[PDB]
Amino acid sequence: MELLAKTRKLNALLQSAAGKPVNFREMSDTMCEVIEANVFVVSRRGKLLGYAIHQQIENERMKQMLAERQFPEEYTQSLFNITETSSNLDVNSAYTAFPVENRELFGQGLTTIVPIVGGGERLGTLVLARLGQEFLDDDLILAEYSSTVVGMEILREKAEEIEEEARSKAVVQMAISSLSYSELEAIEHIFEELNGTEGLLVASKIADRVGITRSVIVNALRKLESAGVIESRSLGMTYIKVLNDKFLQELAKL
Amino acid sequence: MELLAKTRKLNALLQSAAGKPVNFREMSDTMCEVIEANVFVVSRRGKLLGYAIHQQIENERMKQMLAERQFPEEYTQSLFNITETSSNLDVNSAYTAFPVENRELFGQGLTTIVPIVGGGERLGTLVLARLGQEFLDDDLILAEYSSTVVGMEILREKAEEIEEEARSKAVVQMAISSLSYSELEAIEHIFEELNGTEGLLVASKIADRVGITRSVIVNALRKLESAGVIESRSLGMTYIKVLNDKFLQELAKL
Amino acid sequence: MELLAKTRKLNALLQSAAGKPFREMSDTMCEVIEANVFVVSRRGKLLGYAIHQQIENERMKLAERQFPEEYQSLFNITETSSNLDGQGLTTIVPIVGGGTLVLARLGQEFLDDDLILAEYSSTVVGMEILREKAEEIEEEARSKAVVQMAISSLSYSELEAIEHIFEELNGTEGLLVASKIADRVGITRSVIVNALRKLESAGVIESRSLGMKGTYIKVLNDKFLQELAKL
Amino acid sequence: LAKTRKLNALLQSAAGKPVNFREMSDTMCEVIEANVFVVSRRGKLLGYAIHQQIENMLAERQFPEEYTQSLFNITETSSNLDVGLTTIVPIVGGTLVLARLGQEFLDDDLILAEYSSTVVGMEILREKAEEIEEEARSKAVVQMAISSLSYSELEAIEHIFEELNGTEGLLVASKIADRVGITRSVIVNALRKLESAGVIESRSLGMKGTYIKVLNDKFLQELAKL
User: Fold this and answer.
1) Class of D107-148 per CATH?
2) Residues of C with CB below 8 A from A170's CB?
3) Which residues on chain D are in Cβ contact (under 8 Å) with B180?
4) Cβ of B228 and D196 within 8 Å?
5) CA A199 to CA A220: how far, in whole Å?
6) Residues near D72 by Cβ (< 8 Å), separated by ≥ 6?
7) Which residues contact B252 (CB under 8 A, 6 or more apart)?
8) Alpha-carbon distance C170 to C106, whole Å?
9) Which chain B residue shows the shortest CA-CA distance from C148?
10) Is C156's CB within 8 Å of B119's CB?
11) Which of A78, B48, C60, C165, by CA, is between 20 and 30 Å from A139?
């Protein structure tokens, strides 16, 4: 049919959103439009990475599930049993997206569960729901097309995390490479006095501890701030803020 | 009726290849199978990023340009004029994938040109060729859906190449931070004597013609070999080989 | 007679001035040697000096930071040469090997009490000149690494933005209107925002706003735009 | 005795480049003529050299606990401490300890003992600074290599060295593909990226598999998260 129309739009979104970064919200919105049904891109753990509502049913049980952006733990592990595409599931199924729970009112309450694979592993679960039309081969082409693209974008987000988790640690260590012996001993006792990420630094409370100059403490802060690890601010008679997630971790290796 | 059957085949490859290739040969092979037509994924400058033949054509006019993995300059800048899916462009054209001398046999010979765009930038050009019948909405979906994925895969490669081209320089620079002054000036004169990637390191004069210790050259070479920059092999009278594309470039800064 | 008192002092200055090197090391010798000090580079440059009596001859007077050179006998003076050149005298102790220490004084002529305070110092100087280079190549290369790390975090579009951003600034600092760059190539402004963050994350730049007037950006790395000028 | 200042001059006027203060201990031991014992503040024998071998555990790396704490509160130069003479000179900006049964301890012997005690400090600080230099750089390269990976081969690398259970070992081809379900070409691309940064140095051995040897001290550790 003129399914070609609904694919060009789905493609047109992807044909700019391609590259960085990954936006599951705007992506689920387009699926919601071209599949003409509710969309729930669900993580392995049951977390909602993105979603979009085409037809909204007024139910405190459901809209709440959407509020934590988390599905019930029992229902989450149930998706693992679904290995292949399971189309048009009934309101009396253990997989339905319609715990209404007066299901007589919901005769046309349908549910489609397409697993989201990145080849090597099941990365998530695409959940559909609709009250108007049956899920045909037409609606499955768009659902599976999307599920494949989601899988790539989940594997990308997970790849880019591992990349940056290591990159951030790398620049932290290079910043440490800059320090002298005293400057390191300085930095250690500095962030012990703070005991966290933010705080005010009493530079006179140190520099008497070991007899090392307060000017040494200045180098140690500039070198870190030079590599963007921190950023200090002149505050009365010094405020420092850590700009790196892994800085505190790598520092705690005495 | 199932276009779905032809989409599952295409989807099956895509997810089961998300694990980092990128392989345009594998992609082209499947398209050629599900689209049921010849596939030519063309780079911006005419290079074939990938291909797969469904129907063996008979001219060595094409069998040589295919053997060269490169399209003519004239035909390439012709592809820029195509801004959107052009379907079934005769054999009488300037866009046809069948440039022949004997055209009277290729009346049913056709061509379809789907552009490949991402981020806003025209990345490549998908080209289809078939003798059978005209490309239907059936094939146009599979063509456009493929051309969309090829787009975001080209963008992956360009971002991962930057990821690597810059990382490689970082490893080089990090190895240079290990050197002393004498250790550095040694490396400078070593690869001034080589005048290339590989060569034999005499150093019987090269070291003491300028007056550089033969032991400080070892430490300098061991440090470079530590970061995987180089790799030396032994002999009576040392052979060296640069394993980093960007090492020489970064070293050309005094 | 106890030279220990004069060598305990000199030593108690180097333990404190351990690392972070010659402007203050020259003051060190000028005090304990009690003579003018001139720490001269292998090629003439003044790495540090300190004056004790200050002959106001002005055939010499140092903001040149470079002598009228060629001076070449520090060439030729391979050993400590005491009391060269009234008693306007000079002691020249070599540091060159693998710079040069020059002492000047009106009065005594170093005695034998001695250059052993100068030779002692002249050795420590050499170790700190060797420290200078090692702790320079360390930083000059590591900075280039941080920059390349920052660039590796960019996408193709995020890079295209950066290439244009600092092609507009025409220098180190300046105001940036993120408005128009998005219109010159047709890429999202959020891309420009994302690109600037990745640089600012590694401390390459700083980027804080000026309202709708624009965003002010200041490059904090000496090696950024250099490495950026490579295709 | 200006040559006696020139002894200590060119003995470490090399100076330089790396830090080998075992070669420093004999420099003092030859010229102060002494048994030299460069001791860390906590107790480890950072270096030593013996001119006068005594018919007398140095084997090794630390001293008697409350002999070290005795040295700690020797805040000043104290020569001829008897018991076989003894001289203890502080090293701080470590501890230098001398001993002899010969020309006592001259105050010229003290000059060279005190002057050396200063140069030691500088080279302890230099060694310590250029060690933290290394230890951090040794981690930076590992993390650099790890950033090159993606989802699958991080998981591949995680399982590989988990099975290796140590530094070196043989990897049985595709026996590993069972336990992660990813293409096994992924494993190769993983091992290649690591050894491209000097983290490993592998070797293929035909139908047996592939041998691998970790070359980075900090790789095994940093990989342990997870």
Assistant:
1) special
2) 149
3) 17-18
4) yes
5) 17
6) D41, D95
7) none
8) 54
9) B166
10) yes
11) A78
d(CA A59, CA A50): 20
CB contact under 8 A, C157 and B184: no
Instruction: Report yes or no: B247 and B172 within 8 Å, Cβ to Cβ.
Output: yes
Distance, CA of D198 to chain centre = 20
CB contact under 8 A, A155 and D154: no
Are β-strands D87-90 and D95-99 bridged in parallel, bridged antiparallel, or unpaired? antiparallel
Residues near C47 by Cβ (< 8 Å), separated by ≥ 6?
C22, C39, C40, C41, C99, C129
Cβ neighbours for B241, distance < 8 A, ≥ 6 positions apart = B197, B198, B230, B231, B232, B233
Q: Which residue has the tokens 């972070």?
A: C20
Could you tell me the CA-to-CA distances from C197 to B73, C203, C206, C217, D99 in Å, in that order? Answer: 41, 10, 9, 11, 61
Distance from CA of residue C83 to its chain's centroid? 32
Q: Which residues pair with D169 in a beta bridge?
A: D212
Which chain A positions have a beta carbon within 8 Å of D140's beta carbon? Answer: 170-171, 173-174, 177
Task: Indicate the domain borders of chain D.
Answer: 1-106, 107-148, 149-226
Distance CA A172, CA A226 (A): 11
Q: Which residues contact B4 (CB under 8 A, 6 or more apart)?
A: A137, A140, A141, A144
B22 near A CB under 8 A: no
Q: Does B180 touch chain D (CB under 8 A)?
A: yes
Numbers of helices and strands, H then E, in chain A = 8, 8
Burial A99-126 (b: 16+ CB within 10 A, else e): eeeeeeebeebbbbbbbbbbbbbebbbb
Hunting for tokens 């250059």 — which residue is that? C115
Specify whether the CB–CB gap between C93 and C100 falls below 8 A.
yes
Amino acid in the structure at residue A71 = F
Residues facing C176 on adjacent strands: C215
Find residues 70-89 of chain C whose CB sits inside 8 Å of chain B: none
CA distance B254 to C149: 21
Find all residues with CB under 8 Å of C226, minimum gap 6, and list them. none
Q: What is the DSSP letter of A91?
A: T
- Give me the residue label for tokens 């180098």: A219
CB atoms D2 and C80 under 8 Å: yes
In angstroms, this model's resolution equals: 3.0
- Where does C112-153 sit in CATH, by number? 6.10.250.380
How far apart CA D209 and CA D173 sit, in angstroms, is 5
| Residue D40 to residue D57: CA distance in whole angstroms | 16
C-alpha span between C215 and C180 (Å, rounded): 13
Query: Backbone dihedral region of B119: left (phi > 0), alpha (psi from -120 to 50 degrees) or beta?
Result: left
* Site from C152, C187, C222 to mutate, B interface, most B CB atoms within 10 angstroms: C152
Task: Specify which residues A128 forms β-bridges with.
Answer: A39, A112
CA distance B118 to B158: 12
Vertex C44 angle, CA C40 and C48, to 5°: 35
Q: Are B125 and B113 spatial neighbours (Cβ–Cβ below 8 Å)? A: yes
Helix (H, G, I), strand (E, B) or coil at A99: coil
Nearest-neighbour CA in chain D from C193: distance (Å) = 23
As a whole number of angstroms, the distance between CA C60 and CA A212 comes to 39
Q: Where are the alpha helices (DSSP H) in C79-169?
A: 115-152, 156-168
C-alpha–C-alpha distance, residues B207 and B216, integer Å: 10
3-class DSSP state for residue A240? Answer: strand
Cβ–Cβ < 8 Å for D164, D212: yes
Q: Which of residues 143-172 of A touch B (CB under 8 A)?
A: 144-145, 147-149, 151-152, 155-156, 159, 163
